[PDB]
Amino acid sequence: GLRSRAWFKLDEIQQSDKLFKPGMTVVDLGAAPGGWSQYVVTQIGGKGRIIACDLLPMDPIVGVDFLQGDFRDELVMKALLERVGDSKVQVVMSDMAPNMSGTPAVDIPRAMYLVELALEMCRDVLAPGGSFVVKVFQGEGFDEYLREIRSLFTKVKVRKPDSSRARSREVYIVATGRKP
Ligand SMILES: C[S@@+](CC[C@H](N)C(=O)[O-])C[C@H]1O[C@@H](n2cnc3c(N)ncnc32)[C@H](O)[C@@H]1O
Ligand SMILES: [Hg+2]
Ligand SMILES: [Hg+2]
């Protein structure tokens, strides 16, 4: 196809939630191979920019500062913050998901650790009034994580893009209006 399933899931979210606007600065976590950043550049235009990260390498994209490393490493955080600088960040987006073993009592804790890391970076860099979109799986830990996001944002929706496989346990929490 011309674009990946991931690209289509974000297009569906932009259609439903209107997160991306011209000139915004966006953080893209678990960016490889680049669908979400490629999509966001079409919305933020050439004057916006993205600071992206993945364990895997990916093709460069004009307007995207891409750092390849393990987001679980405190060091990689430091380097990502170096690319953000004093730019205000209007959206933090995360599509990170772990290598899955196939056993939920193992895969869910691995996945929840990454979205907890994504929320901690959101707390640290997202500007007041900003948005956070994160891939999360149904199951253990989902209720508490959603409650925490609801306490930090003015509006929160749980989206299941039509492009998301019906068999997949994933959903996307879409939060807008980061509270003061
Ligand atoms: C569903 S894919 C991302 C697809 C991407 N949104 C796109 O549009 O191409 C999930 C990504 O999370 C990344 N990931 C998982 N654990 C990570 C970690 N510790 N640090 C950085 N990226 C991680 C993976 O390497 C994988 O590329
Ligand atoms: Hg990275
Ligand atoms: Hg936040």
Swiss-Prot record:
SUPFAM superfamilies with a match to the protein in the record: S-adenosyl-L-methionine-dependent methyltransferases
Gene3D superfamilies hit by this protein: Vaccinia Virus protein VP39 (3.40.50.150)
Protein name: Ribosomal RNA large subunit methyltransferase E
Keywords: Cytoplasm, Methyltransferase, rRNA processing, S-adenosyl-L-methionine, Transferase
Species assigned in the record: Escherichia coli O6:H1 (strain CFT073 / ATCC 700928 / UPEC)
InterPro entries attached to this UniProt entry: RNA_methyltr_RlmE, RNA_MeTrfase_FtsJ_dom, rRNA-MeTfrase_E, rRNA_MeTrfase_gammaproteobac, SAM-dependent_MTases_sf
GO cellular-component term (any): cytoplasm
GO molecular function, one term: rRNA (uridine-2'-O-)-methyltransferase activity
